[PDB]
Design a protein around this ligand. Structure first.
Ligand code: T7X
Ligand code: LBN
Ligand code: LBN
Ligand code: LBN
Ligand code: LBN
Ligand code: LBN
Ligand code: LBN
Ligand code: LBN
Ligand code: LBN
Ligand code: PSF
Ligand code: PSF
Ligand code: PSF
Ligand code: PSF
Ligand code: C14
Ligand code: C14
Ligand code: D12
Ligand code: CA
Ligand code: CA
Lengths: 377, 377
């Protein structure tokens, strides 16, 4: 029983090792208490508040900012400790804010959510060929799949969802009877170039990061100018890497069905992004579109590393809180999409979605046959 | 360095001892996730949302409830572990919610706060002798002072702050030139009877609880129904008691300054309770008054214990997060009172307030002389 509480404190709050510069790791939480009061003392007695709209906006920014200070003090930092554990406490603190925002949205009607997002941006109310198909949003697909394949560490898992989703996104063409988007982009250029190339780069890098010896010197010990610039930059790369193996030659039916739930919460999060963009109409260049994808992408890095630990390690006995909060966010967005988007469909095709998981299990099972038959042969 | 992190975890998250009924202490957080998702599914797909005000109110309620759940998952439980640590995690979560609400209020103007509190309760817009002076609010004063004296374990501190604050509240009579309240109440009945009796009862109970042997049996081991009822009721009393001694015969000036800061924040909280009520006009029977007083009294106990631990224990080296949040809440309430209440005073008497701390240091210094001279004599 000592192991459970000890093993959970590696998933939830990984601790720093070989602390040599103790300035960055020694809490000063009365210089934080004094800074918060003197900051708010300046924003109270000097800031003009004759504009009612600006008071509400600046109030939100301060509530969000001072919830990140609470996150640094109290929230767990996941399984990550670079560049600093406090970044991953503030990354977790934003997950709780987004989770509670989705809880609130579930009780408002459609007109109140539409009016809420016409307050964030008033403009929302009024709203050879290969080269053009690559743009700043192609880097989002490429570098998103490069990051995902880094922590999934499986060609089969990544290509099963890079293929099935881009087939699903092409099937959802009756939602879009206006834009003349050609099918070749979703099946050829996305699967092969953005997703296919991005997966390879994240798998080439991950292979490097697991054959790398992590002997970390101390920033004080180095006595060359180029050496300190080298060690400061490398503080933003992983300290170590865990060898990820999802299946085994003898994998329990609980392990097969834990990987299968992974490929369904994962493949649901690609369905929330598609629908949240269609129900609440905003373009891909709006900060609500790419800002949320960056945030969900940032939550994914410690969620994949906490789901893997719980799924495989036999002494964990608890799922980390960041993996918990990602679970509700992925599921609450679906309810928001179902509740608000009840008019964009007339004949609902959930048969495709029902067919969408049958061909995912049938393909995970082909991954099991691939591994088991390869070990013997 | 090992002791600091170990000693802080005895103040931030005290762990349970002699767990015999493991049902109450084994996390089931995927069941929590499923319950949250199904509850929100029901509230989304069955609740009528044609009334916007009801939508906003129920959204606030649900956000608070699920922040309580998040605090059960992630927030620390202070130095207390009875009846369950989760109650104190939820208490800390409510502390954080109130602190963020105070952060938000500092940017709104007076009219926006008035409109907000009229939204909370629309009625706010339209708003022999000894026996009558005793009511349920007298009971509130009595039991609050009983709890305070229980956690401070000092006649000197409690009586000093009681006398000083009642004198201050009597002095603040130019704020109230309409109600015909006299000095008799505040100087006699609110010192000798209510506060005096509460302090005496709290000190008697603390003396009992620090001479009590806490041999806790197991609810399963007892084989008499009366015994099981007895052990179930006693789960809501402290498991142990700490002998509290603020001063010493040889007390460092740091200890004297820490006790002085403790007393100053205590009297500041009393001032906040007075000024919030007189600025934002709500009567003493409104939930905004007594609910806030109950909430602050609930925050006070782990705050007092953690402040004592940090002040006296030499290996703590960090102040618990609940104490941090309590201090920031008190200071933010003071800032709110200063910012919004700038019209209820014309000639500001801070000389009395300046005189209010000089006579607290003098009275603390008489406590030091009392202890030191008593030990030799
Ligand atoms: C926010 C900024 C936070 C920094 C983020 C990244 C930057 C790093 C550069 C370094 C700056 C110098 C300060 C570094 C902070 C030191 C490291 C740090 O996270 O301490 C925080 C408090 O945090 C401040 O009290 C922070 C005090 C800073 C105040 C300095 C003056 C401000 C003007 C304490 O976490 P810790 O894990 O020790 O302590 C806890 C942890 O807070 C919880 O997860 C749990 O209760 C438990 O597991 C336990 O581990
Ligand atoms: C409606 C239309 C049609 C659609 C239908 C579709 C639905 C079809 C049905 C799908 C159901 C399939 C699941 C079946 C049960 C699986 C049991 C299982 O293996 O349990 C466990 C793992 O699984 C878990 O339960 C883990 C925690 C999950 C909850 C947190 C969510 C975080 C999400 C993060 C997602 C990240 C995404 C990243 C994105 C890139 C392991 O089993 P165990 O033996 O208990 O564990 C042993 C290990 N310990 C306990 C010893 C440590
Ligand atoms: C304007 C008009 C006139 C008005 C003027 C008035 C203003 C006049 C000026 C008043 C200020 C008086 C000087 C204060 C000096 C303090 C030095 C000191 O002793 O430090 C420390 C304690 O003190 C602290 O700093 C503790 C943490 C405080 C912050 C938490 C807030 C929550 C409090 C919750 C209050 C609860 C209330 C409950 C109510 C019932 C101890 O010193 P150290 O050696 O560092 O500690 C050794 C111990 N370790 C470190 C080894 C572990
Ligand atoms: C004074 C500010 C400097 C400061 O924090 O000193 C502290 C020293 O001194 C103390 O320990 C006590 C400081 C006095 C009490 C301040 C309470 C907060 C009130 C603010 C209201 C605004 C003031 C003006 C408006 C009233 C510095 O402490 P630190 O270096 O962070 O020590 C690390 C803290 N842990 C980890 C040990 C907990
Ligand atoms: C950091 C965490 C990972 C970021 C995930 C990828 C971001 C993403 O897809 O957003 C992208 C923004 O582009 C960026 O913000 C890229 C930033 C560089 C990579 C980081 C947007 O990607 P998307 O909305 O999925 O692209 C759809 C838009 N088209 C192609 C249909 C027009
Ligand atoms: C509903 C379905 C989708 C759910 C998405 C949920 C959120 C996902 C992520 C959202 C991040 C992007 C949100 C942007 C909202 C407004 C759009 C815009 O142009 O922004 C600018 C603000 O931007 C900033 O300055 C910073 C904003 C920080 C937001 C909190 C971070 C939390 C991360 C998590 C606009 O500012 P402006 O035009 O100069 O001022 C006009 C704004 N007012 C005053 C009129 C209000
Ligand atoms: C199924 C509900 C029962 C349940 O939680 O079983 C779990 C077992 O089973 C599992 O371990 C996996 C459960 C399946 C995946 C559910 C993820 C949340 C989705 C919900 C969406 C709503 C469904 C309908 C809408 C789609 C029960 O586990 P537990 O006894 O709490 O185990 C304790 C958990 N720790 C501490 C070990 C972590
Ligand atoms: C639980 C934490 C302790 C509660 C502290 C006492 C609360 C308090 O004084 O509120 C009281 C409510 O009364 C209660 O809610 C009593 C509840 C029973 C005791 C608990 C209100 O006390 P107050 O507003 O400070 O009394 C001023 C009102 N008069 C006498 C001027 C008319
Ligand atoms: C500004 C300076 C003071 C700062 C104090 C800050 C807070 C301090 C503590 C406040 C706790 C008491 C707040 C009462 C507000 C409304 C008054 C009232 O009659 O309440 C009732 C609700 O009550 C409930 O049913 C439960 C409310 C729970 C509130 C969150 C708990 C957090 C604890 C911390 C009113 O309900 P109703 O009349 O039936 O419906 C009308 C309400 N709407 C729909 C019009 C909105
Ligand atoms: C701005 C700082 C630039 C980087 C300067 C630099 O040298 O940083 C060193 C520190 C940690 O220094 P150590 O080598 O003792 O850490 C040992 C290490 N944990 C290990 O695993 O060996 O990193 C940070 O906290 C950086 C916080 C950045 C927050 C943005
Ligand atoms: C602001 C810039 C932040 C940039 C932060 C960055 O690049 O490194 C942060 C973490 C470092 O993780 P640790 O070395 O603490 O743990 C290591 C743990 N055992 C593991 O298995 O990784 O790496 C990842 O997220 C890896 C995915 C990369 C995601 C880009
Ligand atoms: C409703 C339950 C009635 C009480 C029934 C009862 O017998 O209590 C069960 C447990 C007692 O736990 P142990 O007896 O193993 O000791 C525990 C600890 N190690 C000690 O020895 O102190 O208490 C709770 O968690 C009660 C949670 C109440 C939450 C409201
Ligand atoms: C819902 C009803 C909750 C009622 C809860 C209750 O009465 O007990 C809760 C705590 C129990 O404290 P522990 O035994 O965990 O720690 C013991 C620690 N070493 C100490 O010093 O106390 O007691 C106090 O708050 C004591 C003040 C009383 C405040 C009323
Ligand atoms: C893991 C990092 C998460 C960061 C969240 C991204 C939010 C950015 C919002 C930017 C809005 C700018 C408007 C012009
Ligand atoms: C330590 C416990 C804190 C509980 C907070 C008290 C809030 C109660 C509000 C009740 C409102 C009822 C309106 C009729
Ligand atoms: C422990 C009891 C908490 C609730 C106190 C209710 C006070 C009601 C006051 C009504 C006066 C008219
Ligand atoms: Ca696509
Ligand atoms: Ca009084």
């Amino acid at each position: 029983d000592v192991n459970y509480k000890m093993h959970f404190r590696m998933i939830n709050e990984q601790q720093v090792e070989d602390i040599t510069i103790d300035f960055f790791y020694r809490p000063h939480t009365i210089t934080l208490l004094s800074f918060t009061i003197v900051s708010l003392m300046y924003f109270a007695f000097t800031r003009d508040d004759s504009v009612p709209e600006d008071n509400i906006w600046r109030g939100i920014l301060s509530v969000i900012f001072f919830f990140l200070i609470i996150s640094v003090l109290a929230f767990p930092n996941g399984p990550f400790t670079r560049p600093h554990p406090a970044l991953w406490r503030m990354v977790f603190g934003l997950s709780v804010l987004y989770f509670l925002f989705l809880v609130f949205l579930l009780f408002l009607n459609f007109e109140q959510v539409k009016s809420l997002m016409y307050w964030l941006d008033p403009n929302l109310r009024y709203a050879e060929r290969i080269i053009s198909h690559f743009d700043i949003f192609a880097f989002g697909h490429f570098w998103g799949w490069a990051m995902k394949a880094l922590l999934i560490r499986s060609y089969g898992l990544c290509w099963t969802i890079s293929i099935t989703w881009e087939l699903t996104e092409l099937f959802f063409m009756h939602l879009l009877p206006n834009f003349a988007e050609c099918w070749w982009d979703q099946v050829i250029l996305d699967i092969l170039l953005c997703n296919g190339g991005g997966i390879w780069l994240g798998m080439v890098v991950c292979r490097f990061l697991e054959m790398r010896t992590y002997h970390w010197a101390s920033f004080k010990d180095i006595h060359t100018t180029t050496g300190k610039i080298k060690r400061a930059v490398l503080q933003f790369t992983p300290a170590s890497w865990t060898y990820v193996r999802w299946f085994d030659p003898k994998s329990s039916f609980q392990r097969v069905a834990g990987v299968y739930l992974f490929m369904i919460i994962w493949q649901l999060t690609e369905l929330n992004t598609f629908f949240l963009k269609h129900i609440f109409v905003f373009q891909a260049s709006h900060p609500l579109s790419w800002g949320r994808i960056l945030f969900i992408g940032g939550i994914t890095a410690p969620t994949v590393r906490q789901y893997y630990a719980y799924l495989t390690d036999t002494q964990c006995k608890r799922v980390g809180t960041q993996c918990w909060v990602f679970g509700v966010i992925g599921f609450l967005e679906a309810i928001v999409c179902i509740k608000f988007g009840q008019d964009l469909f007339s004949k609902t095709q959930i048969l495709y979605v029902v067919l969408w998981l049958l061909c995912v299990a049938f393909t995970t099972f082909l991954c099991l046959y691939g591994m088991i038959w390869y070990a013997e042969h």
